[PDB]
């Protein structure tokens, strides 16, 4: 719906339109905490991700997504198998991470 | 590899099957509650129709 | 090099998420989606009307 | 990597190999690049 400046504008408007938000008569305080979820993509577990994607969609699609994350990465003469953590370079990775982050939002 | 892979996998599978059973049981519970609500609505409509018939008989 | 060592450590030192933690995460997800009445996404049909788009 | 490497076993699967393959496919589902070194065959061989 919105560009990130409009997201910032709406966040300012929501803060301003909360109840009694600037009232500090009775000692109440307001806190904004901004933080970053550290190493989420790195620490995604592929079996658990398969279970959560199996919750929201068809099991063939979920199995495709996690099997797709289990690949061999190569760079020149180096190679290893990714077996832990997601690959952010897959086309559907933004979708998969927004769903995973929604579960983290629930937590 | 670790045996924690085996315990982790089996825990997730039993959690999935438990959730599926809970969803099935709850779906049957609101199915029966919908059945009883529909029957109560039918009885209410029958009572309203009987009242309308009595009013029509009194007016006639 | 660091990433190969991390992958190797995951195979050797097991899933870092405990099974209790995983079950709690899964249960929170099922309770949420059941509360939101979410319908799971189907596999795309042979004659899905939006496939071309 | 998938055919011509001399460490690739193209003989028929033994019963111990089949039991290991099914057991690991139950443990780490659809993770064939992870399963294959533990079984001892290629990922495509294990999947097929």
């Amino acid at each position: 719906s919105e560009v990130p400046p409009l997201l910032v504008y709406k966040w300012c408007q929501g803060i301003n339109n909360l109840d009694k938000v600037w009232d500090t008569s009775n000692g109440e305080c307001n806190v904004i905490i901004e933080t970053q979820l550290s190493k989420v993509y790195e620490k995604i577990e592929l079996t658990l991700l398969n279970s959560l994607l199996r919750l929201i969609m068809d099991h063939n699609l979920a199995d495709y997504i996690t099997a797709k994350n289990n690949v061999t990465l190569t760079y020149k003469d180096m190679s290893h198998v990714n077996s832990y953590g997601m690959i952010r370079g897959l086309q559907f990775s933004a979708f998969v991470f927004q769903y995973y982050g929604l579960i983290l939002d629930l937590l | 590899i670790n045996d924690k892979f085996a315990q982790f996998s089996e825990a997730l599978f039993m959690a999935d099957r438990h959730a599926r059973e809970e969803v099935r049981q709850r779906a049957m519970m609101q199915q029966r509650l919908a059945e009883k609500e529909r029957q109560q609505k039918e009885e209410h409509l029958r009572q309203l129709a009987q009242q309308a018939r009595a009013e029509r008989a009194a007016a006639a | 090099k660091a990433e190969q060592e991390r992958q190797h450590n995951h195979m050797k030192d097991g899933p870092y998420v405990s099974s209790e933690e995983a079950v709690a995460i899964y249960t929170t997800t099922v309770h949420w989606l059941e509360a939101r009445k979410f319908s799971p996404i189907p596999f795309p049909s042979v004659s899905y009307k939006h496939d071309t788009k | 990597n998938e055919w011509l490497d001399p460490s690739i076993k193209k003989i028929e699967w033994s019963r111990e190999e089949d039991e290991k393959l099914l057991h690991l496919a139950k443990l780490m589902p659809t993770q064939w690049r992870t399963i294959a070194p533990i079984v001892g065959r290629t990922a495509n061989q294990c999947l097929e």
Binding site: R54 | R17, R20 | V30, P40 | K26
Partner: peptide
């Protein structure tokens, strides 16, 4: 029974895990 099973939000019957010993 544990793989081709579809989502648990759809209800449905769990296929029997004929485990034995």
């Amino acid at each position: 029974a544990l793989t081709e099973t579809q989502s648990s939000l759809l209800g449905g019957e769990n296929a029997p895990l004929a485990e034995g010993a």
